[PDB]
């Protein structure tokens, strides 16, 4: 799923 | 230079 | 969410 | 001096 | 660093 | 037990 | 691993 | 009665 | 921008 | 999240 | 799937 | 000086 | 079937 | 210089 | 894995 | 004289 | 990443 | 005279 | 070195 | 009945 | 048997 | 096998 | 270790 | 700091 820092902008 | 979520894999 | 420098006034 | 948009870096 | 579940080979 | 491929992701 | 029942000979 | 290595899984 | 119902997976 | 009828395997 | 009532013996 | 409903966000 | 220090990279 | 599990032998 | 020089921000 | 961190190693 | 001179104006 | 970005490198 | 089977017996 | 190299891996 | 002091690989 | 010069790179 | 007269930049 | 003769004003 989410894998390392993710960009919910 | 780089946004909110970016994770050098 | 904004880019590079941004001041409004 | 400088104006309001001062994102340097 | 991979995925949800992991056993190998 | 199921075998080596797994991880409903 | 191999399978759920096993007595290789 | 069952034979030599087997299993159903 | 973000106000009404949503999810991201 | 999921959908309604999901019986793994 | 597999079913109910599967007895062996 | 600005307007009552400003939201650039 | 694996030999000395392993290399799952 | 070396990478992972660089077994030698 | 990477090699030796790694200058992340 | 170069970058954030170099590691000749 | 910005080098040697860095003189703003 | 010196002025900005006086950077020989 | 060796993992299949051998004839030294 | 067996007595030599016989891995059965 | 076999012959001499052995050094099979 | 190998002799006694064994620096390994 | 390393070689003779190593000096870095 | 390097070899011969450096002026730079």
- CA distance readout (Å), V5 to J3, U7, V1, V9, X9: 64, 20, 12, 11, 56
d(CA N8, CA M5): 7
* Contact criterion met (CB < 8 Å) for C5 and D5: yes
Q: Which residue has the tokens 């010069």?
A: V5
Q: Are the C-beta atoms of J1 and I7 separated by less than 8 Å?
A: yes
CA-based nearest residue in chain S for residue T8: S4
Reported resolution in A?
3.7
Determine the Cα–Cα distance for residues G9 and T3; give it in Å rounded to an integer: 14
Q: Cα(O8)–Cα(U5) distance, rounded to whole angstroms?
A: 58
CA O1 remoteness from chain centre: 9
Q: Looking at beta carbons, which residues of chain F come within 8 Å of E1?
A: none
Region of residue F4 (phi > 0: left; psi between -120 and 50: alpha; otherwise: beta)? alpha
Cβ contact F6–E9 (<8 Å): no
Largest CA distance in chain I: 18
**In chain H, whose CA is at the least distance from the CA of G3?**
H9
T3: closest CA of chain S, how far (Å): 7
Q: How was this structure determined?
A: cryo-EM
A5 interaction partners in chain B (CB closer than 8 Å): 5-7
């Amino acid at each position: 799923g989410f894998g390392n820092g993710n960009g919910f902008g």
